[PDB]
Amino acid sequence: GYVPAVVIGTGYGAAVSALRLGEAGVQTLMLEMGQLWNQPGPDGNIFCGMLNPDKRSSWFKNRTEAPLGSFLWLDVVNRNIDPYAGVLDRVNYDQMSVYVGRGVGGGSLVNGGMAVEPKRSYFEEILPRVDSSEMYDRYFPRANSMLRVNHIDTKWFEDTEWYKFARVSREQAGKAGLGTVFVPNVYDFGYMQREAAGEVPKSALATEVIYGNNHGKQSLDKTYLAAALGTGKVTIQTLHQVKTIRQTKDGGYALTVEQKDTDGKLLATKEISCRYLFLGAGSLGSTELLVRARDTGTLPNLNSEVGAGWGPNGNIMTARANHMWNPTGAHQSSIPALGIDAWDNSDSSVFAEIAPMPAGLETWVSLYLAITKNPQRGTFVYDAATDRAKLNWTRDQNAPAVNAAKALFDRINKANGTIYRYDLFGTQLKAFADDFCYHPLGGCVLGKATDDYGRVAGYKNLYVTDGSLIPGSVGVNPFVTITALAERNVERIIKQDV
């Protein structure tokens, strides 16, 4: 049936959009292909931890997988599983694997909570058509407040065993003349203190993050989406995947929507129509819907920029072997708190999160997720044969990202007389993982596929809201940017269009 506004997905762009629509009095239906994560599972918890993965860990796979970097220690806990509507989806393209959340809250369910504003001068470089003053004066602050961003207590951080890993990398980076920064987070750091004191159930301190956190993490279901539901004007239907979008003969948009069970069985196909259609299906999902619509002739006026301009936020993972006298600790909080900021907007830029490892015993490894400035971009191209968007990225396109990460970590190795690990990402010697992405950005780029507020070119009342808007790179963990840009966009769209 008909609803005034439909929002596809329930990640950051979607959640912001739905809240503001509901506050404006616009009845809004959100369609989410994954689950509402609120049912206790076989262990009494909603989510599985990293040491006990089960079918809840994975979107329709037949075996669990170790978190990247951890195979040498966590393969032992892997098990065959039933394909199920689990929370983390590794999406495999030709030469790139992109990890995304599936559920009410999208990637907020599975991410590390790291809530970081981009450098203003870099924002101005990547999005020159956008007014940076309103972003920094108004929209970024609004996003941080509504996301429930908070800051770790420095004394607790300095003293706790749970962050020894971070302090070790800080000291090592310092010998190379590199500084660290604290990283704000949506995980409640007060709660985390009480976890360490044995006062509340552990989550971050029980090797949970990438398959969800049972406690502590303020994912979007607790923040924006709870508020959206609270308006009385928003509803969320789960296990509903939008497949096609067309412009109706009499006005607005019509969607074909598959309803499935948690085993993936098709229960129904429904037609849902609307006046205003907002895409918040992510870089991958929104772009796929639009390349499909263009190439199958249901939105034939979409432009050639739909599909273009994708990048992995320069994501590269690497690891160093510490000296025996610098153990990183058996107990590592699953929520990172420190990064190495070597980002100056030049091609050598690196912003690297000091990543915990989940092994739960001493390994002497320091792990890093580097964000780099690599101009290479990929394109999503529709394959009509399989009805899928395929990402045309090749592994060699990550060479500039590897080069920048390697130059930075080579400085740290030289200053400390340490070497890389080469064995964490497969049997072949490989110090830099260069074919994964946690931060997919682009495919429907702001000002290219859309106007400067995400209005899709060629169409009225059709909007993209999410990471597909970002031109491939923000230089930091992306969700605060996605949220702030969505605040800007929906506020303008409601004022001018609704």
Ligand SMILES: Cc1cc2nc3c(=O)[nH]c(=O)nc-3n(C[C@H](O)[C@H](O)[C@H](O)COP(=O)(O)OP(=O)(O)OC[C@H]3O[C@@H](n4cnc5c(N)ncnc54)[C@H](O)[C@@H]3O)c2cc1C
């Ligand atoms: C392991 C990991 C760690 C990360 N750590 C951080 C971090 O600490 N900080 C940070 O800033 N970022 C982090 N990220 C990235 C961040 O989570 C994403 O950038 C962000 O979630 C993207 O928001 P979005 O709104 O574009 O889409 P998403 O959050 O991906 O949401 C899209 C939603 O749409 C749904 N959907 C897709 N297609 C359809 C369809 N056709 N029909 C219906 N529903 C659909 C999906 O199931 C999903 O729920 C991390 C991500 C991962 C995977």
